[PDB]
């Protein structure tokens, strides 16, 4: 498809050889279509954890070590170990995320991860039994005014929805804990997503703000 050409082109810029570019391509294609596995790596990056592992038979085992002290990352995939810098590790993931990660439909209802809130906010929601649920209002919004990065979703807390007296919320994908129910989608949405949120953003080198491509 079109995304495969664009994806291999985003791998040319990494300071690595063509042997490792093919390996990173296969790892990215495999992790991106497995949505639960890719979010686990994002949370590992967010917490600066040290290790990621999503092993399996038939040559599906993937292990990633993040050596935060030496700004090094080791991506092992079928006895082929790929080394690259931490900044190149984030660029690889950012363009994997831009071009290959599924985008949730509008109106999707999700449960967010309370482990990412300040304690005073958690204890306030717990007092009244408010679970951390939300609905997708918008997707991959451009951060103004420079418009050099996007953020994955704009949401409102469920069941209150969008209100006049409360702001919509910008959040990243790693805030999501589970999808309760996806919203409506069809061929119009798939074409719009591919054009506006993948191809047009790739052309302007707009990626998700969490990978912090400076």
């Amino acid at each position: 498809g079109e995304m495969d050409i664009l994806y291999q082109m985003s791998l040319n810029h990494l300071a690595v050889i063509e042997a490792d570019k093919e390996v990173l391509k296969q790892v990215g294609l495999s992790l991106a279509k497995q949505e639960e596995a890719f979010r686990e790596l994002q949370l590992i990056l967010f917490n600066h954890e040290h290790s990621y592992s999503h092993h399996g038979i038939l040559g599906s085992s993937i292990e990633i070590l993040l050596h935060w002290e030496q700004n090094n990352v080791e991506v092992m995939y079928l006895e082929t170990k790929v080394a690259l810098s931490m900044i190149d590790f984030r660029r690889w993931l950012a363009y994997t995320d831009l071009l290959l990660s599924p985008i949730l439909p509008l109106g999707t209802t999700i449960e967010l991860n309370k482990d990412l809130l300040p304690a005073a906010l958690v204890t306030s929601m717990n007092e009244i039994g408010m679970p951390f649920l939300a609905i997708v209002l918008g997707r991959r919004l451009l951060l103004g005014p420079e418009d050099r990065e996007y953020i994955d979703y704009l949401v409102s807390i469920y069941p209150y929805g969008l209100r006049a007296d409360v702001n919509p919320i910008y959040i990243s994908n790693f805030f999501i804990k589970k999808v309760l129910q996806e919203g409506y989608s069809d061929a119009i949405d798939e074409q719009y997503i591919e054009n506006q949120y993948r191809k047009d953003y790739f052309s302007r080198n707009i990626v998700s703000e969490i990978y912090n491509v400076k």
């Binding site: 809130l117 807390i157 702001n167 919509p168």
Partner: protein, 37 residues
């Protein structure tokens, strides 16, 4: 009275504080559209 507006505003303002983008476009739409109708 059945909606915890104050807590909902605190959640939005805390999470939007993590993002380098302005959210004031929403309240601008709200207070403007209320006076038009």
């Amino acid at each position: 009275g059945s909606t915890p507006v104050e807590l909902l505003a605190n959640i939005s303002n805390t999470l939007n504080g993590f993002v380098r983008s302005n959210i004031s476009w929403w309240k601008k739409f709200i207070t403007d559209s209320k006076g038009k109708r």
